[PDB]
A paper describes a structure:
Examination of the human PrimPol sequence revealed a divergent acidic motif within its RBD (residues 513–527), we termed this motif RBM-A. To determine the molecular basis for RPA70N binding to the RBM-A site of PrimPol, RPA70NE7R (an RPA70N mutant optimized for crystallization of complexes) and the RBM-A peptide residues (PrimPol514–528) were co-crystallized. Co-crystals contained a 1:1 molar ratio in a P212121 crystal lattice. Continuous electron density covers the entirety of RPA70NE7R and 12 residues (514–525) of the 15-mer PrimPol514–528 peptide are visible in the electron density maps. Within this short peptide, residues aspartate 519 to leucine 523 are α-helical in content. Given that no α-helices were identified from circular dichroism of the free RBD, it is likely that the α-helical peptide identified here is induced upon binding. A striking feature of this α-helix is that the primary interactions with the basic cleft of RPA70NE7R are via salt bridges between aspartate 519 of PrimPol and RPA70NE7R arginines R31 and R43. Hydrogen bonds are also found between isoleucine 517 of PrimPol and RPA70NE7R arginine 43. In addition to the ionic interactions, PrimPol phenyalalnine 522 sits in a hydrophobic pocket made up of RPA70NE7R serine 55, methionine 57 and valine 93. Isoleucine 517 of PrimPol also has an aliphatic interaction with the side chain of RPA70NE7R arginine 91.
PrimPol is a member of the archaeo-eukaryotic primase (AEP) superfamily, whose members fulfil a range of roles in DNA replication, repair and damage tolerance, and it possesses both primase and TLS polymerase activities. Evidence is accumulating that suggests the primary role of PrimPol in vivo is to reprime DNA replication downstream of DNA damage lesions and secondary structures. In this study, we present an in-depth interrogation of the interaction between PrimPol and RPA, identifying that PrimPol possesses two RPA-binding motifs (RBMs, RBM-A and RBM-B) in its C-terminal domain (CTD). Comparison of the RBM-A and RBM-B structures reveals that the peptides adopt almost identical helical conformations that occupy the basic cleft in a similar fashion.
Author numbering:
A (entry chain A): 0 to 120
B (entry chain B): 1 to 12
The structure:
């Protein structure tokens, strides 16, 4: 019952209700740098709550060391302690992760948990 | 949910 470790429904609650008081437990599915320019790199995450995945997660620049020193990597399980939602002009929403704790390393989790499906925004 | 491109993503 590995999906029981994840906050199933947190993604829908964030995107539909604007709920930002929750501290959801999510799994990183993928991380990649996004094209920036001459400034700190930015990192985009495909995250899963066990039910849905969402590719619109952005890491605050102050958390870049977690990715660059490899504690925050694909498959790891983390709990979001502070995040904000920003809505673009075209209506799509960005979840910016400001504070998070890696609960279990990627090496200890090992695999994608469950079969989450892409969230329909 | 058509995925947001990087070009419009640090748009804030």
């Amino acid at each position: 019952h590995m999906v029981g470790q994840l906050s199933r429904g947190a993604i829908a609650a964030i995107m539909q209700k604007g709920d930002t008081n929750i501290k959801p437990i999510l799994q990183v599915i993928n991380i990649r740098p996004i094209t920036t320019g001459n400034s700190p790199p930015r990192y985009r995450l495909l995250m899963s709550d066990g039910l849905n995945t969402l590719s619109s997660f952005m890491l605050a620049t102050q958390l870049n060391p977690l990715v660059e020193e490899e504690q925050l990597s694909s498959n790891c399980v983390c709990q979001i302690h502070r995040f904000i939602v920003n809505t673009l002009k075209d209506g799509r929403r960005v979840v910016i992760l400001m504070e998070l704790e890696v609960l279990k390393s990627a090496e200890a989790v090992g695999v994608k948990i469950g079969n989450p499906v892409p969230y329909n925004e | 949910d058509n995925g947001i491109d990087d070009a419009y993503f640090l748009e804030a």
